[model samples]
Target chain A: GFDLSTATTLFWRPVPVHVKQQDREDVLEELTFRILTGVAKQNHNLRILRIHISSDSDLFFLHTLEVSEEDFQSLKNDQCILVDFASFPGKIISLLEKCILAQPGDSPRFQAVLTIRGGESVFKIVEINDFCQLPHITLAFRPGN
Target chain B: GFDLSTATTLFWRPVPVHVKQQDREDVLEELTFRILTGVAKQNHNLRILRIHISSDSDLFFLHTLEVSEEDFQSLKNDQCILVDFASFPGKIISLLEKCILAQPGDSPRFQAVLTIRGGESVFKIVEINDFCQLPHITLAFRPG
Candidate 1:
């Protein structure tokens, strides 16, 4: 039995606005989608209760994920890269290496925050599990926006 | 795996109005209590979703059983028969046989119309299943 009593993630390729070439933000967002959706399809009981897209504007905010069948179905398209994370898939090792090695703004770690359902709230960090397992991505900022 | 994709019924025991024990208008309302509690204990998921009780004036209809726990508990003094339909099962068989025999003034057939949640209807021939099945009786049925 797939007991979804813990945190999980699914990642996929993100379609960025304006920027088409290989970039930092685009890679990270794609990785995130892959990890989240992968878990959803494997475990039927694990209903996606909420999702959050955050920025500095809102303070102590409550967010919810808009659940739509069309959005989920999009992950299967060739444009999306799906990676389901059960406990924590070790395949992130290579992706992390690429992210950390990139120049400052062009690195794998972006400044955005994500809050998944069933995840614990930690001080100054996105606490995914008791072990604090988080995924990484590769990105290199160009001179332009 | 009994896949109950839609809300269907397992078993239903009617609230017997009057059973003639010879010359008596013996109103036996205890059957309702017995059936409800019996199903609950079995973890049957058998909810009494609707109830229609008709009197000389008109009919009273309630969408939810919402049978109060207080009322259930109070029945200690209300005279009840604790029927375990699991054991002593097959009670419906005799009832069905009696109905099929069609004695004068006896109901030869009865039907249970179940309106499922998704706007579908399930009409069961209770007279057949009960009589064909046999020996399932529990709890008290006394004069009302």
Candidate 2:
């Protein structure tokens, strides 16, 4: 008579964390992705998605999204968190493909999101300088969620 | 052992996609927090979290935290989605910082739930604005 699928939120985004002056060398831009993927490796219900820089800056990174006031309000701070979806498997998977296929990026704008459990947040990218430009979105998942 | 991380359902309201246009916008405004963070820009495992909204008006900008039996049942176009804690790193970061929070608006009749480590849902923030809002609650790790 009716559908039997649990409707849950499942999505993900990346945020650059503040890198201390000493550990600057240890910080690898690619490793951020690796760490995120590593985190996603555990749950069978979760899926890994696209990554985005922070809106607190100006210079674009690997990807970019025209940072606006709304973008800043929607996704800001190093506390950029990725949302998650825990509902119908088919619909979520399908949406994922849509995002990937429709990722928004330009000469100075890139955008993406992430999914996690317990809850979610956002990240934005802003432009400032060239060499000293910001390069990460600091964020965390629900504690022990 | 099976690692089953528990999470709560925040913002349980209905948004009737067909009835009114402004009402849908109201729902969208309330859910921007969810879309920007709750969804992976392009992950292949996230679904829509359905909620109930008003069935009247063409402007649709009212926020409420109350719903009826029929409003909850009839409102099904918007799918309810969830984000897993055990798998998402950002969520993990939030939990570690003690800044993990969830909130829902009134027009959407928010329903916030607190999930435990053992997979138990606890209703915490309901029909409120800006509940459980925290930022970076932990400084255990040396950032680089």
Best by lDDT: 1
**Model 1: per-residue Cα lDDT over B101-143, one tens digit each:** 4433543233222222332222111221211211122122212
Which regions of candidate 2 are displaced past 4 Å? A1-87, A103-111, A114-145, B1-144
lDDT of each: 0.28, 0.26
Residue lDDT tens for model 2, B72-99: 2332222111223222333323332221
TM-score of 1: 0.18
Cα lDDT tens digits for candidate 1, A56-92: 3333333323323444344324222243322222333
Model 2 C-alpha lDDT per residue in residues A37-104, reported as the tens digit of each score: 21133333444332333323333232312222233344433233232222222332333333334323
Top-scoring candidate (TM-score):
1
Which window of 10 residues has the lowest lDDT sum in candidate 1 chain A?
A: A122-131
Model 2 scores a TM of: 0.16
- Least well predicted 10-residue stretch by lDDT in candidate 1 chain B: B129-138
